[PDB]
Amino acid sequence: STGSATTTPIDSLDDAYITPVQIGTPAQTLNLDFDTGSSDLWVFSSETTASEVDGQTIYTPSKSTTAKLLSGATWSISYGDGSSSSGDVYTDTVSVGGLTVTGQAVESAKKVSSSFTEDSTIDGLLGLAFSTLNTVSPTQQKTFFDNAKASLDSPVFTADLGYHAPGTYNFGFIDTTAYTGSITYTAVSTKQGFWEWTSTGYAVGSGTFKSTSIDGIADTGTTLLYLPATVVSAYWAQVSGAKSSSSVGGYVFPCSATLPSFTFGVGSARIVIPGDYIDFGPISTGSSSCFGGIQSSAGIGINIFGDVALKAAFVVFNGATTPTLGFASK
Prior knowledge:
Cathepsin D, subunit A, domain 1; six-stranded mixed beta barrel
């Protein structure tokens, strides 16, 4: 089997991408944030504290003839941005882009933190990291991909995120028309539960490539590119007037600037992030200070190849017995 679904930016900045997901019978379609940095499929629901729902579409398990309470199971998750959610668990039929999993754990939120409530466009998350990170207790549950894997034509999924445009998540096949050149594969460590890999270096604009190992995670659920402070300083030094602002929370730059590209290495291959992809717009409405899309990972404890980096590539998440990642230009 295969599946293929379009993923759509939630706003004009590509802050996140939403993908429609069918849950239950008859289907209830919710728009979920596919997150290769976590491993829970959780949704706003009829159980979510009413004051914490503000415009989201909810899953109502009592209206699904295939829903079953997973007795005794609870979940609770906290994300790298400080947000969180928790609740109980149902199993139900879940379909993505025509690919169907029966008995998928659907984690129903009883509580969500304010950042989720305040974002009416995201109805929940669909985790695509390794199932070892799933938070369901006392019986850990499998991700949608883990449940589907054995049925897929090939045990892979691909992320093809658009810049200021929709893109595609495919399951079970490589669309060889979706990228240019070849796909370069690179080793993955699953020891922290992430799609963790080592970039071979970077370049700023037309500058020379610096060969240096940068361990980080491929994380579709993180907006920005978080890299070591040395690398980030080298990038922003090429933007007149850019500076790190402790009050804003990162590097800002004059909105009048033209940003240089940023290149990262995948083995001997190179992925080029155009400068425009690094502009996240005014820090507040009407400001001439703009927020940068490359930020320091100091204090996060891990480097994160978030959407800024991934949307410059066609990315293969190869879930074979020994997982690997692939990157191609597009």
